Symmetry: D2
Subunit: 120 residues, 4 copies
């Protein structure tokens, strides 16, 4: 279900493997910002969701440092997986950059990403 | 300065180990209230007195309990004698499509070594 | 371009009046009053027009002890829309304040 | 209660008037107009009073092409406070929309 290759509305590709113990591992490649190539993704999911047709809660993080670039920032996505003919993951994200004390009021961006198993 | 025990303003206790290549692993917490954490951090931060960007996730499921939800914390570690982690968090619960609009809470937490 | 009737994704109807001094007044449809501000002198370079508004969910008939604020921008053009993120806060006791605030997003269109 | 002069943790000054059926009006300060709403009939059980307001960062001297909304609750008591979370959106292009909005939190007191 969650395991597979996902794309957000921006071209980004996230390759995610769901483990049997609630672990989420994989790789992100962003189509925007200060990023190049692949970045390590790690997260957790609810490995035994409700019966009742509710979604599957999950979250993951990417720190935007790899061997090519370092953006001194990290993003966390929080959302739910919803099965169906068109499986989708709906998330909200927080992106925090490292700042000095004086600039911390403006260190965090917030947005929403919708992931699909079909590239837009 | 990150590896160790951190406490938030709620009493809760977080034990985190920060690996050499940017992994964060540990637990949030008796057994029944203990949960797994996994995250990532900037292992090569700037020198300019900037904070170290990081983030982590906890799904609220263990062997004993399952709240069908996950929290992510996004934030930065600040050093010194008043070492702190300042974060904002998102908590999402699994919902039906009908109730998705109220699936996510937002808030902030501050973690201290004491 | 902002003044008029707007519809978000779950059919709610917002009637918005943009005043020349930057004020936004109108109603969200039971029916509640809205009030906000917008940039009454945006850039002409394709940038959007920044805005925000608030609805407290109390009227003559019902009270939910909560308020929502929408923060976003207007984008004009053939398919004008207002893209927003929102925060919904409910009155809670001090000990439930951690769970007093929801976050989401809303898109408004003219049809 | 809510009417008065409020200061946030960074020292900015908000002068707020609470109107009879839930209007918030006032200024933030370099001085800008604020507008919002609040629950004029809060719960008696000890809960806080839900509210929100907006400031568009345009006045007669400067315009940053951006707007902030605060969502939160007023807590009466020893330290009357207003605990909020805020969103600041800047007018951007289509291409830069994904990075248009910052989020944070603010505590206000009369001290
Ligand atoms: N796929 C996505 N890319 C952007 C959003 C949220 S994370 C962001 C990319 C940031 C890359 C590093 C940076 O620019 O600081 N979703």
């Amino acid at each position: 279900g969650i395991t597979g290759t996902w794309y957000n509305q921006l071209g980004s590709t996230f390759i995610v493997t769901a483990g049997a113990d609630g672990a989420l591992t994989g790789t992100a490649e962003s189509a925007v910002g200060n990023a190049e190539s692949r970045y390590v993704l790690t997260g957790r999911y609810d490995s035994a969701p409700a019966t009742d047709g509710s979604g599957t809660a999950l979250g993951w993080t990417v720190a935007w440092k790899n061997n090519y670039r370092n953006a001194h920032s990290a993003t966390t996505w929080s959302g739910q997986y919803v099965g169906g003919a068109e499986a989708r993951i709906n998330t909200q994200w927080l992106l925090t950059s490292g700042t000095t004390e004086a600039n911390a009021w403006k260190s965090t961006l917030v947005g929403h990403d919708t992931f699909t198993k079909v590239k837009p």
